[PDB]
């Protein structure tokens, strides 16, 4: 059977989920229980966490503009996702998506992670650039597996304290 239903018009679907493509929800997965995790991500949303994905991530910025803060070659860098850009991110490149625009919409495609292949989420010190904290997770459902993780970082000065310079990371907002 067509487990995932018939084809359907993507722009209309994005329009009809506009109320979810903004805070507090911000994104919406298109199909459930698939190997390909296909998500539309709206805005605005800024964040301070860096994602260490053990597999590739595909981006197609359909509407509006965004950017990825990255660590590449040991430096902080930015990759801009201008409206109409596509991009393939290699495994493990640390990235922190920033989505300043309301009404923006990005197609993001990932793979289900097999058991034992963990995702990393980490924060870096704004003063000295040292790793402040890292949590690894077996990512099964982002709705339940990720928000508490971020919440526990914001709530702990211990977790936010830079082991190098002692600066306490701001937490939720940069």
Q: Which residues are annotated as a binding site for substrate?
A: 57, 99, 110
The verdict on 75 binding its own copies (CB under 8 A) reads no
Buried b (16+ CB within 10 A) or exposed e, 50-82: bbbbbbebebebbbbbbbbbbbeeeeeeebebe
List the strands of the sheet with 131-137, edge to edge.
75-81, 66-72, 94-98, 50-52, 119-124, 131-137
Indicate which of Cl ion, its own copies, Fe ion, none lies near residue 3 (CB less than 5 to 8 Å, by partner kind). Answer: its own copies
CA distance 88 to 56: 7
The verdict on 56 binding its own copies (CB under 8 A) reads yes
CA distance 164 to 91: 27
Answer for which of 55, 137, 146, 149 binds its own copies (CB under 8 A) is 55
Stretch that binds its own copies, among 55-63, 97-105, 126-134, 155-163 (CB under 8 A): 55-63
Site string for Fe ion, 85-124 (x = CB under 5 A): ----------------------------------------
**Contact of 94 with 51, CB cutoff 8 Å:** yes
Size of interface with Cl ion, in residues (CB under 5 A): 2
Closer by beta carbon to Fe ion, 16 or else 25: 25
* Three-state DSSP state, 140: coil
Quickly tell me which residue has 């260490």 as its tokens: 52
The verdict on 64 binding Cl ion (CB under 5 A) reads no
Answer for which of 20, 22, 29, 38 binds its own copies (CB under 8 A) is 38
Q: Residues in the site for Fe ion, rule: CB under 5 A?
A: 51, 53, 125, 127-128, 130, 162, 164-165, 167
């Amino acid at each position: 059977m067509l487990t995932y239903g018939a084809p359907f018009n993507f722009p209309r679907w994005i329009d009809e989920h506009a109320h979810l493509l903004k805070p507090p929800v911000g994104n919406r997965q298109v199909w459930q229980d698939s190997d390909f995790i296909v998500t539309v991500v709206g805005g605005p949303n800024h964040r301070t966490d860096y994602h260490d994905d053990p597999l590739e991530e595909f981006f197609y910025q359909l509407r509006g503009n965004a950017y990825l803060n990255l660590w590449v070659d040991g430096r902080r860098e930015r990759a801009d996702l201008k409206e109409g850009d596509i991009f393939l991110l290699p495994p493990h490149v640390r990235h922190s998506p920033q989505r300043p625009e309301a009404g923006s919409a990005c197609l993001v495609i990932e793979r289900q992670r097999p058991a034992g292949m963990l995702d990393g989420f980490e924060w870096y010190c704004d003063a000295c650039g040292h790793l402040v904290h890292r949590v690894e997770v077996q990512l099964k459902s982002i709705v339940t597996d990720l928000p508490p993780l971020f919440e526990s970082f914001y709530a702990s000065e211990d977790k936010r304290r830079c082991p190098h310079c002692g600066q306490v990371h701001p937490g939720r907002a940069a």
